[PDB]
Design a protein around this ligand. Structure first.
Ligand code: OLC
Ligand code: OLC
Ligand code: OLC
Ligand code: OLC
Ligand code: OLC
Ligand code: OLC
Ligand code: OLC
Ligand code: OLC
Ligand code: OLC
Ligand code: OLC
Ligand code: OLC
Ligand code: OLC
Ligand code: OLC
Ligand code: OLC
Ligand code: OLC
Ligand code: OLC
Ligand code: OLC
Ligand code: OLC
Ligand code: OLC
Lengths: 305, 305
């Protein structure tokens, strides 16, 4: 029983990850529909999470990490990947329906398997190349039938696959290299990342968009409602990423990306219902084939030498 | 000297392959512009090749092969791959500019490497996945900017990659399994394939297109001139495929496809010149990136563990 029970506590971390991420995605897109500034918004979300974590340390509510220069340097690459994937994903969110963004990001386990095998010196069974046929065909079919498609919205989402895979693999190194450091719990690893990531993105956000006026492009929405939406999606942005690093602490980077693809099916279904996103038969079939292909690719990689 | 003598003779085979294939491609496209019946035209080209080979046998100009039940069974899958690839490629030739068809078929070495490794139990280095990025990006950019793009023209060309790789691999097995049958020279192997392939395609061709009237869609072409153009491209269709099996007999199936990609650079350059094909800046950048990626892919697979 304790073995299956331990998987229930870990599975609950995955549920929180999915539950917080769905609240984030809906509120984040509603913010972008009123306030189309992805650079500044994504930077705000990192800063709110940075401030939230420092408050927990100040109040003694969370163990303070024994920060060393060795750890900081070992967190640069996780932070560069997080910042780049975050800014690219928010840019995609601002340009297309978020359901299409998560379809593109559903190919993350393929990038994760390649990057992980490059590091671990592994090799791929030829059958994994066959499973790329439904993935490439599915994504191409989904993009060809997506009403909101733009080339920039598609490419920025594809970029985030590379950046987040880089984040997850390098973060996994740090978490294992500092396994005996009891103060570097999973939440503190992401806490330091979101603090570094904030200052990494901050100059780009100001150069790209400046200080956008706090005005809703949707007529009739007060500034207080716009500010509450910005703060609401920023709070749940941090919570879902924080809980996800608990999940990353308990699984491999590739398994983490598989858990992400399951998350995207939930977000895709939920977002098209909430937003009444128009979806044609070919578009549903294309997206479904691509995600089935990603699972088959993962199954082929896992079950073959 | 003996090994260099052989590689020089093999090199002359590749030259005849490229030279005959260029003559074919120009004449075949000029025929399709006048007489847009890809099923029947591709069937005629197989039959004219079948008749050419039987004349050599009847006149004593070429050793007759000892045809056995085992050999015919070993040539069914080579003929299936040849018929499907030939019919799919000709369909693509009739729908888009042949320069675009050969850009899509330039990815053949990737399919060939997967097919070989799948049969031989080989494994892929992770860096071969990175080389897919310029291949997929280049082909996508090329297709997004090709003025004559149609989905059917693109997909039929992609299908021929799978069919011809199947043909090359299964043919190489039969040629190796029958290496001690002295009557089965490389030209007799393809001679038997074009005979089987002709009768495989014939009922489908009549099913799809019936008996097309020998009338040119371009004014000023007599029926005799159209008939001459059909016979001309049919002769060089058989000649280039016949000499290519001399190349296949002396190289691996992967090296054969790499030779095919070199061939298509020549075909693409010559065809855009002869037909004055419109090519934008973004279009030949994408096509070049795609072919560079395929060559980088082949370099990675060959030079890596
Ligand atoms: C580019 C902005 C950098 C500030 C980020 C700090 C995080 C503080 C949270 C919200 C700031 C106010 C947002 C409303 C405008
Ligand atoms: C419960 C704590 C959750 C939020 C954490 C602090 C975020 C404050 C950021 C901006 C407010 C500044 C307003 C100007
Ligand atoms: C499509 C290419 C996939 C690349 C995936 C990035 C791999 C992560 C790189 C370095 C990890 C540092 C150890
Ligand atoms: C080994 C690496 C992978 C190699 C194998 C890659 C296979 C990709 C081939 C074709 C994708 C095209 C998918 C089918 C696209 C159909 C598009 C379509 O139906 O368009 C409808 C129209 O646009 C409605 O508006
Ligand atoms: C293994 C990792 C898998 C990830 C890689 C997936 C393969 C990428 C597929 C196609 C690239 C190009 C997208 C094709 C989209 C063509 C349709 C299109 O863009 O037309 C829209 C038009 O511009 C307005 O509606
Ligand atoms: C590997 C990095 C690749 C380069 C990253 C580019 C991302 C910036 C957006 C480009 C949109 C493309 C413009 C297409 C407009 C039509
Ligand atoms: C950026 C370092 C790696 C770059 C490697 C890929 C090259 C594509 C780069 C920029 C595309 C230009 C996008 C801007 C087009 C605006 C229209
Ligand atoms: C402002 C409210 C702050 C939300 C507090 C976080 C709530 C649940 C996550 C706890 C999961 C960690 C185990
Ligand atoms: C909720 C249960 C999650 C369990 C997960 C286990 C793995 C599921 C694998 C394949 C089914 C997923 C295919 C459905 C993908 C959504 C297709 C879709 O709705 O596309 C909308 C379109 O993309 C709008 O832009
Ligand atoms: C549609 C017009 C196409 C052109 C016409 C089709 C060509 C004839 C096909 C096969 C002949 C093979 C017969 C083999 C005879 C060998 C006799 C022998 O060698 O003894
Ligand atoms: C009419 C030309 C006859 C050519 C004879 C010939 O080329 O036969 C040699 C060998 O069989 C060729 O593969
Ligand atoms: C995306 C890559 C797809 C590559 C598909 C290659 C298909 C041919 C494979 C084996 C030929 C069969 C020969 C084995 C038995 C004789
Ligand atoms: C990483 C593998 C190479 C990346 C291949 C992507 C192609 C980038 C080249 C030109 C696109 C520029 C688009 C300009 C928009 C106008
Ligand atoms: C592990 C790696 C597995 C394989 C991963 C493959 C990822 C390639 C995905 C997308 C490239 C698409 C590039 C599309 C180039 C942009 C097209 C464009 O710029 O628009 C064209 C033109 O402007 C319209 O009129
Ligand atoms: C080994 C791997 C090599 C094969 C990898 C190939 C990847 C190509 C991806 C998608 C194909 C379609 C993408 C291009 C589609 C854009 C063109 C388009 O759809 O335009 C619609 C309109 O009908 C015309 O103008
Ligand atoms: C056994 C005969 C099979 C080979 C058939 C050869 C067809 C004749 C070639 C060109 C005629 C037209 C050339 C003038 C243009
Ligand atoms: C009308 C029929 C005219 C037939 C012309 C055949 C000419 C050369 C055959 C090529 C033989 C290649 C030699 C390599 C061995
Ligand atoms: C590499 C050059 C490819 C073909 C050379 C053939 C060039 C033939 C040029 C034909 C000129 C023309 O306008 O016809
Ligand atoms: C002979 C070369 C042997 C060494 C191989 C060299 C490798 C790549 C050459 C670059 C590829 C050639 C670029 C052709 C691009 C092009 O012309 O595209 C036009 C477009 O397809 C209209 O439909």
């Amino acid at each position: 029983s304790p073995t299956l029970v331990h998987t229930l506590k870990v599975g609950f971390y995955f549920f929180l990850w999915y539950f917080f991420n769905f609240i984030f995605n809906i509120a984040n897109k509603r913010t972008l529909n009123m306030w189309k500034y992805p650079w500044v918004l994504s930077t705000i979300q990192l800063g709110v999470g940075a401030l939230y974590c420092t408050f927990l340390w100040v109040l003694g509510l969370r163990t303070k990490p024994n920060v060393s220069k060795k750890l900081i340097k070992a967190l640069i690459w996780p932070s560069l990947g997080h910042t780049l994937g975050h800014a690219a994903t928010c840019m995609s969110f601002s340009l297309v329906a978020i359901s299409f963004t998560h379809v593109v990001k559903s190919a993350e386990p393929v990038f994760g398997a390649v990057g992980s095998a490059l590091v671990l010196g592994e090799f791929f069974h030829p059958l994994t190349y066959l499973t790329l046929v439904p993935i490439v065909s599915g994504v191409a079919l989904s993009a060809a039938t997506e009403l909101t498609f733009t080339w920039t919205g598609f490419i920025t989402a594809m970029i985030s696959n590379v950046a987040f895979v880089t984040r997850n693999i390098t973060s996994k190194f740090t978490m294992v290299d500092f396994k005996n450091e009891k103060t570097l719990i999973a939440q503190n690893t992401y806490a330091l990342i979101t603090i570094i990531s904030f200052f990494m993105e901050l100059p780009f956000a100001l150069l790209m968009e400046g200080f956008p006026p706090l005005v809703s492009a949707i007529a009739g929405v007060s500034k207080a409602k716009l500010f509450g939406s910005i703060m609401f999606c920023s709070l749940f942005y941090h919570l879902y990423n924080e809980v996800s690093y608990l999940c990353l602490d308990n699984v491999s980077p590739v398994s983490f990306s598989i858990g992400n693809t399951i998350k995207r099916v939930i977000i895709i279904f939920g977002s098209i219902l909430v937003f009444r996103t128009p979806v044609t038969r070919l578009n549903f079939i294309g997206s479904t084939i691509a995600i089935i292909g990603t699972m088959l690719y993962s199954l082929a990689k896992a079950k073959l030498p």
